[PDB]
Design an enzyme around this catalytic site. Structure first.
Site, PDB file in Angstrom:
ATOM      1  N   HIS A  74       0.831  -1.193   0.000  1.00 35.14           N
ATOM      2  CA  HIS A  74       0.000   0.000   0.000  1.00 35.14           C
ATOM      3  C   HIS A  74       0.870   1.249   0.000  1.00 35.14           C
ATOM      4  CE1 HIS A  74       0.318  -0.425   4.459  1.00 35.14           C
ATOM      5  NE2 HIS A  74       0.070   0.862   4.546  1.00 35.14           N
ATOM      6  N   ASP A  78       5.713   3.863   5.155  1.00 32.55           N
ATOM      7  CA  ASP A  78       6.459   2.612   5.548  1.00 32.55           C
ATOM      8  C   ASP A  78       6.627   1.585   4.470  1.00 32.55           C
ATOM      9  OD1 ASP A  78       3.699   2.178   6.289  1.00 32.55           O
ATOM     10  OD2 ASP A  78       4.210   0.220   7.212  1.00 32.55           O
ATOM     11  N   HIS A 137      -7.005  -1.463   6.464  1.00 34.16           N
ATOM     12  CA  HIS A 137      -6.018  -0.567   7.066  1.00 34.16           C
ATOM     13  C   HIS A 137      -5.878   0.721   6.210  1.00 34.16           C
ATOM     14  CE1 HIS A 137      -2.268   1.068   8.439  1.00 34.16           C
ATOM     15  NE2 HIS A 137      -1.802   0.958   7.200  1.00 34.16           N
TER      16      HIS A 137
HETATM   17 CO    CO Z   1      -0.179   1.890   6.380  1.00 37.54          CO
HETATM   18 CO    CO Z   2       2.019  -0.411   8.342  1.00 37.23          CO
END
Ligand code: CO
Ligand code: CO
EC number: 3.5.2.6
Length: 215
Positions: A74, A78, A137
């Site tokens: 995604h 990070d 998420h």
């Molecule tokens: Co994320």
């Molecule tokens: Co993450």
């Protein structure tokens, strides 16, 4: 399971089998290193360009082959943070179109946008399926499945046992996330290991844990 560090402790790799390793960098984050007959393939790179260069150099040296491809799960920092490094080294950065357009919108260089809802890739001998299960998420989160090992890379869609809450929900869809997890459970009914986005490796129990965190 054999576990090898950078000098500083900031990067660690841990073997799952002959050809699959988990990479972890520092807040911890996980991805995979796939040792294939055609090169190294990563599932996710790291927080920034500094750690991503270090990761690539450690693995190229150890395995004596080049990193050829990365699957970005995604568009958050990070996961997408080492994109500049990937692009300038000629490492193919695979993603969904949504992941690419979120990356652009947020000021990052763009991955390929080649991955569909279900995409099947082969890297030499190594088979990799990518699957977009729905929002959770983030809007764009995907999972990665290695059908030769029944290993699922959950990413931040999947919380580790240690995780006692959902973490960052600013970009999450907490009323869809459960359906998305169910979609993964329906697609992959026999799972050997589940690699969460952060934290220790588990099994299907981590998906059940995530469901409970969503109540
Ligand atoms: Co994320
Ligand atoms: Co993450």
């Amino acid at each position: 399971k054999t576990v090898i560090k950078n000098e500083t402790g900031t990067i660690s790799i841990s073997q799952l089998n002959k050809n699959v390793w988990v990479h972890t960098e520092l807040v911890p984050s996980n991805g995979l290193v796939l040792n294939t007959s055609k090169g190294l393939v990563l599932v996710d790179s790291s927080w920034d360009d500094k750690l991503t260069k270090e990761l690539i150099e450690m693995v190229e040296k150890k395995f004596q082959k080049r990193v050829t491809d990365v699957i970005i799960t995604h568009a958050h920092a990070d996961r997408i943070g080492g994109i500049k490094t990937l692009k300038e080294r000629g490492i193919k950065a695979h993603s969904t179109a949504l992941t690419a357009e979120l990356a652009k919108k947020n000021g990052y260089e763009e991955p390929l946008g080649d991955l569909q809802t279900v995409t099947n890739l082969k890297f030499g001998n190594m088979k990799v399926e990518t699957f977009y299960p729905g929002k959770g998420h983030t809007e764009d989160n995907i999972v990665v499945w290695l059908p030769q090992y029944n290993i699922l890379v959950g990413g931040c869609l999947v919380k580790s046992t240690s995780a006692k809450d959902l973490g960052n929900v600013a970009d999450a869809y907490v009323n869809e996330w459960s359906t998305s997890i169910e979609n993964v459970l329906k697609r992959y009914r026999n799972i050997n290991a589940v690699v969460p986005g952060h934290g220790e490796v588990g099994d299907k129990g981590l998906l059940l844990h995530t469901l409970d965190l969503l109540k």
